[PDB]
Amino acid sequence: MEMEKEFEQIDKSGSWAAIYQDIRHEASDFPSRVAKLPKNKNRNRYRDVSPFDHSRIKLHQEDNDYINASLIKMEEAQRSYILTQGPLPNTVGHFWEMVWEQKSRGVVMLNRVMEKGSLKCAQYWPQKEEKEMIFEDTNLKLTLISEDIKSYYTVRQLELENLTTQETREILHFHYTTWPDFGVPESPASFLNFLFKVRESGSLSPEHGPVVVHCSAGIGRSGTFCLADTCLLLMDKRKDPSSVDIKKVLLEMRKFRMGLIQTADQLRFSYLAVIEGAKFIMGDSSVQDQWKELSHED
């Protein structure tokens, strides 16, 4: 069923909440035993958001290999994402260790450090060139190289140094700064513009390790980003783009991390992003320029 008509069908009947609960009901449940070990309680930001054991990212250290992060492997799309929570004060070092070990080229941040008057994430990157960060527990140095601030998202160019081997790598930080505290954005143009900026950077491409995507828990906004990217890539690939079933793609992703897409509004927004993104995928290259204008990124 053409998702655009599915969308109007659901919108007219106001059944977004009902579709969403059906997804919740069907979603996978797999063990998360390592996440619940007592030695790992201070490595989880939220008691109710844990990686499954079968898809968790393991740190390459013998002491404790645990981080709250999952690998989401989309075989048909040929895309890998790492979804993770906003780092904690005590896990910032583990976060950058994961980036290094997985050979990621990009980090996608979909939250602000403070929202709704509370802290959602540690400040885990440097704010000034001359004030670098050193993570003593994992033996990494991180330097801000350049910053590129637009009205609702910022791109940063970071240098990550493994202090043991003195190897360095360029990491791109994509920070979407204008997701509202409540609800979802009214139009997705701003959403799509940012996604296609990440794509253009090479950060999602198979030459590199998986992109790291996070918000505060790593399931809501983060899920909306991965779901829209994968759906658009599948519509690009297949002979019949109309055979992209967003609900089924979401259920596949939820085999790898629980809870992806946290609200019915986020589900609705995901449909709207994919429907609008389709116009470009199907040959209207000019739509990308519009989104940039519509986004008022100056």
UniProtKB/Swiss-Prot annotation:
Expressed in keratinocytes (at protein level). The modification Cysteine sulfinic acid (-SO2H) is found at residue 215. It is an enzyme of class 3 (hydrolase). Its main location: endoplasmic reticulum. The modification Cysteine persulfide is found at residue 215. GO terms for molecular function: cadherin binding; enzyme binding; ephrin receptor binding; insulin receptor binding; non-membrane spanning protein tyrosine phosphatase activity; protein kinase binding; protein phosphatase 2A binding; protein tyrosine phosphatase activity. Keywords: Acetylation, Endoplasmic reticulum, Hydrolase, Membrane, Oxidation, Phosphoprotein, Protein phosphatase, S-nitrosylation. It is a peripheral membrane protein. It catalyses: O-phospho-L-tyrosyl-[protein] + H2O = L-tyrosyl-[protein] + phosphate. GO terms for biological process: actin cytoskeleton organization; cellular response to angiotensin; cellular response to fibroblast growth factor stimulus; cellular response to hypoxia; cellular response to nerve growth factor stimulus; cellular response to nitric oxide; cellular response to platelet-derived growth factor stimulus; cellular response to unfolded protein. Oxidized on Cys-215; the Cys-SOH formed in response to redox signaling reacts with the alpha-amido of the following residue to form a sulfenamide cross-link, triggering a conformational change that inhibits substrate binding and activity. The active site can be restored by reduction. Ser-50 is the major site of phosphorylation as compared to Ser-242 and Ser-243. Activated by phosphorylation at Ser-50. Its EC number is 3.1.3.48. The active site is at 215 (phosphocysteine intermediate). The modification Phosphotyrosine is found at residues 20, 66. GO terms for cellular component: cytoplasm; cytoplasmic side of endoplasmic reticulum membrane; cytosol; early endosome; endoplasmic reticulum; endosome lumen; glutamatergic synapse; mitochondrial crista. Substrate binds at residues 181, 215-221, 262. Interacts with EPHA3 (phosphorylated); dephosphorylates EPHA3 and may regulate its trafficking and function. Interacts with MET. Interacts with NCK1. This is Tyrosine-protein phosphatase non-receptor type 1. The lineage of its organism: Eukaryota, Metazoa, Chordata, Craniata, Vertebrata. The chain holds residues 1 to 298 of 435 of the full protein.
